[model samples]
Target chain A: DDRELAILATAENLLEDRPLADISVDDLAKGAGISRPTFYFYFPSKEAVLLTLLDRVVNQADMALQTLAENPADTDRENMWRTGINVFFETFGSHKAVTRAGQAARATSVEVAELWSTFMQKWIAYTAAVIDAERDRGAAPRTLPAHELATALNLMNERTLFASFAGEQPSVPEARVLDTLVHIWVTSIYGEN
Target chain B: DDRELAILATAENLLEDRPLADISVDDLAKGAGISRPTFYFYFPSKEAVLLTLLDRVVNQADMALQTLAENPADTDRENMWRTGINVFFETFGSHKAVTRAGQAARATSVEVAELWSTFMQKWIAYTAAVIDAERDRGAAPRTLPAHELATALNLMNERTLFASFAGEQPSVPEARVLDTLVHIWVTSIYGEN
Candidate 1:
């Protein structure tokens, strides 16, 4: 049982160096410093291990956002958004290997797609709520439907962060990535002040 | 040579039915009304065939955007932007299979990546120049730097269009997807009156 937990832990560490697509069961077994038979004894398959990992990363991300909602670090809405964005970067950014693998698995795995779908539903709903509240307060102007706007904004964050962390060229510079996204969110949601 | 051209046409037709990932030489060959060996006679590999497909998609997309620029269908900036986006949706959306394959190939194939990369360079530069011109004319607000803004906006268009056409859930509604993105562009660049 202890070795089982070690195998699990080792899978995560292996993902840190490369996405799950490139990692093999052999590598995971050896990297955990165990025999192939032992690896099988602990986990049924490499994909099974990755499904576990994808679940963990998704759960951690959900928890991070939930925690921020419970205890926001900033009073200003812009800073609040800034803080919110930071939580995602901290959680997903640090776990790029799994995130990339998770993204790849999204279309292929039933369990994985459902897991990601649930996260996206909550994220867009929370964002839409914020946009509606800002409008009610008269700080934001009426614009595209809140749900649709929220969905689009979330997609931007998703793609931008992936491009940035995944080493894709022609991405937003790290220095100003935060400011650029925040500007769009602020301007897109609330008109120019 | 006629059969070779027929194979190419068949690949494009097959992609319309499903993405390249789900396709195989068996389907491409049979669908082209030929046998496997004959298929090989026309193309060396499935990936090789896909590379040709990706090149075609990328080239068609470039041609559409360029044609729009040369023809200038709309005078108003918003309408102009709308026309530009429509060209993409028409080119890529209608060919979801290859676009998805092209996107997947972008990371794995050097030749494919270069093909896509070259298109993006022209896209961003053309956009940034327009932003600069708009700034000069005092029609648009200078918030985020032009190049960064261009990149972010392009990402939104790419993701939004993909989601809508590829059957991704929680996407911009196709009926309003055009107007919604145009709103973001107009507002994000030109402040509300």
Candidate 2:
């Protein structure tokens, strides 16, 4: 497990400075003080190592979504919602390097693509369920199905965050980015500012 | 110009079924009936070729946006708005291959990234102006600044459309995709169905 941990740590460090596509088994192995065979034995490929890293952060996000969904009618609903989104941003931000590598890797790898899709579907389902409940109470829009709206909004969050956080160009300040996301999410879901 | 056109056409053809990252100067030269040095003579990198292709498409989208902006007072306002969004999807859809390649290329290429940012800013400005006018007329929400809302909504459009049109996944039906987009746009800007 320590060897595996070292491999993951090395990959994350490398990803912070460069893309996973630029990294190789040798680089990962050398960084971990192991041979290539040992690295491959621990993980099938660099993508797997990235996925292994993503799994930890994504689970944190998963728990955050679960908590948010558990009580949509919290006393402090607005703060609760903002906190839920912040949880995702914080988790994703912490692992920004591997996260970006996965974004690029998904284009070429079916495994990575499927991994992302699965996680996205989970989020969409949770969001859609909340929307359905709100729509039932005459709050959310009924023009489009909850599932579709949820998917669109989630994708918006994803694309906006990924663009802002994954690049070298300084983004519109962090607070502004968070505020814009919260605005879009709250407005589209509630049909009110 | 013919030399450039030849190289551009070759790149587009290759991109039709493959990613920009998969294509190289040697391949572009061979396909265009030119030498490697000549390929570099016209453009510095493969991304520049993709940008040239995107420039044409972005212009078409710009014209479409202008048409929609010229008359927000059309008798059938809802249909008019729908048509505006369609113009973008249609234009982007026609060149889905190169468009996707551009998305993948942006992370690595500074020129491509700036070119995209410039075009996106133009769209956001146009959309924000329209939103400001609508809010002034008391038809749209004044909760968030027009510029912020426009930026968020445009990104949603870009992200959702890219994901649906760029892949092999059984995307939400095309009609549903369009309707979902119109729903978010109309609801966010107008605040009422």
Candidate 3:
């Protein structure tokens, strides 16, 4: 158990120093106090190291999502948007470097790209389900389509995340930016009634 | 003038062969049939060659935009949406490899990335302004935010264009995709009005 934990921590540490492309299996193996071939006995490639790290983050986020979903205030439409946006960003920022590296690595690797895309598509689906639930309650635009909202909100999340990492840093304050994005998400899905 | 054209043409051909990163100054000079220093006589670095390629594309798109502005059909709000999307893809698709190279080069070079960002921001502003004009002209929802429409369109274009290059032939016909995107844009901004 200690050996496996050591290996994961060693791989995660590499992200702090340099971009993923600069990292090597040897670096991870040596950091973990294991021989190179012995490291291969545990995981396949550098990206295997990434997948190992992602599992931890996803589990943490899943527990948070469960709490958010169960909270009574989620019944309030406006508060639901606030809670969703806050939680998503908080979770994302928790492991900024590792997530950023995973994103960049995804762009160049199909297997990793699909892994991320599948997770994202599920996220979009879950968000869309929320919109649909509101529409069904007649508290939102019954005519508003959920899939379209998912596409729009997902894009906003992606553009914001990518812009932040790429260093364009939108002109607005981060909180203001998040608020504006939430407003866009809300309005595009549910108009001012 | 002739040598400048030769250098530009060489840039165009080399970009097609491989990514700009893979090609060196020597490769560029050889392609242009000039000494290495002579290649620098026209452009300072490989990024300069990419900027030159993008510059031509942007100029043509700008001209098209001017022509678009003068078209009487812009009064038709949906036509304006169609026009913007068509010009965007049509302009960028002609130099897909160069456009890819320009985007790819942004990671290493801030100056070139800024150029790419400014070019895209122009499109964002122009597209938003056109939508705002339509709203002001009473052909669309006056309350519909122009910036939001622009954001949606820009994101859709990004997804589709990248899909084209990444080998997703887009099962939805081009016309269908354009129609769907325009419909989503109008509905999101105008909201069933």
Top lDDT model = 1
Kindly report, for each predicted structure in the order presented, the TM-score of its chain A compared with the true chain A: 0.88, 0.88, 0.86
Q: Provide the lowest-lDDT 10-residue window in model 3 chain A.
A: A166-175
lDDT of candidate 3? 0.67
Instruction: Quote each prediction's TM-score.
Output: 0.90, 0.84, 0.70
Ranking of all candidate structures by their TM-score, best first: 1, 2, 3
Candidate 1 lDDT: 0.79
- Evaluate candidate 3 by giving its C-alpha RMSD to the native, one decimal: 5.2
Clash pairs, model 3 backbone:
none
lDDT of 3 at A101: 72
**Cα-based RMSD of candidate 1:** 2.6
Stretches off by above 4 angstroms in model 3 are A10-14, A23-41, A58-73, A128-149, A169-172, A191-193, B1-49, B66-86, B121-193
lDDT of candidate 2 vs native?
A: 0.78
What's the DockQ for every one of the candidates?
Answer: 0.57, 0.47, 0.18
- For model 1, how does the per-residue alpha-carbon lDDT over A1-193 read when each residue is reduced to its tens digit? 6776677788888877876777888888887889998898878888788778778777888898888888857588788888887777778888788887777777668778778778887899999998898999998888789999888888888888777777666678766777777877777887632
In Å, residue B49's CA in model 1 sits off its true spot by: 2.0
